[PDB]
Amino acid sequence: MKGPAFEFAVAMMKRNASTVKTEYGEFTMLGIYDRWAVLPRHAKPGPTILMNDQEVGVLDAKELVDKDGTNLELTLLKLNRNEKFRDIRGFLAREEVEVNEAVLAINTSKFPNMYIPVGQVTDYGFLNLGGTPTKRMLVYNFPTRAGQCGGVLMSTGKVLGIHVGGNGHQGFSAALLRHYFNE
């Protein structure tokens, strides 16, 4: 709910975020570097996606899992496009980070250009999400709404995670770690 978090959030969204539709829904999508971006796993991007209402080919998609095959609920995708994202890997943490004030940033047709102060972010860890064991979950409390998936969780100078579910007054992000984007 602090200014610097919002200021960082707005800068990051304006440069690296877009609105994406897959067969399964409409999502916020953050680009990370080069032609690599990130979606919630359940977006299940196909051979093409709609990115700001424009068809874009997908060159690679990687559904992330840890060293023991456990779901991390993130899909990294490489887009067939000429523009490059600003490289924002320097704003990713090396491990799960907790903060006292974060902002969740959404941009879809249902929630255009919206920012939500979500307060404290906890490293929750293990969660059974829909029946699938899942790790590196971050938790925060705010009045959730459907259609917020892919929203970007941030704090001053950090992209902490990608929103992957929520119900009632509880939201969860997959932690967005620096080593996911080595190479």
Dihedral sign for Cα atoms in the order 47, 52, 55, 57: negative
Three-class secondary structure of residue 178 per DSSP: helix
Q: Which residues are annotated as a binding site for Mg(2+)?
A: 101
Structure tokens at 61: 């998609």
Active site residues: 42, 73, 149
Determination technique for this entry: X-ray
In angstroms, this model's resolution equals: 1.9
- The b-or-e profile of 158-181 (16+ CB within 10 A means b, else e) is bbbbbbbbbeeeebbbbbbbeebb
Max Cα–Cα distance, the chain, nearest Å: 40
- The contacts of residue 83 (CB under 8 Å, 6+ apart) are none
Burial class (CB in 10 A: 0-12, 13-18, 19+), 20: buried
Nearest Cα residue to 176 out of 72, 101, 84, 63: 72
Residue ranges and CATH numbers for the domains of the chain are 1-15+86-183 (2.40.10.10), 16-85 (2.40.10.10)
Residue pair 57/80 in contact by the 8 Å Cβ criterion = yes
Q: Which residues are annotated as a binding site?
A: 101
Nearest Cα residue to 174 out of 89, 99, 71, 87: 71
DSSP state of 34: B
Gap between the Cα atoms of 155 and 117, Å rounded: 10
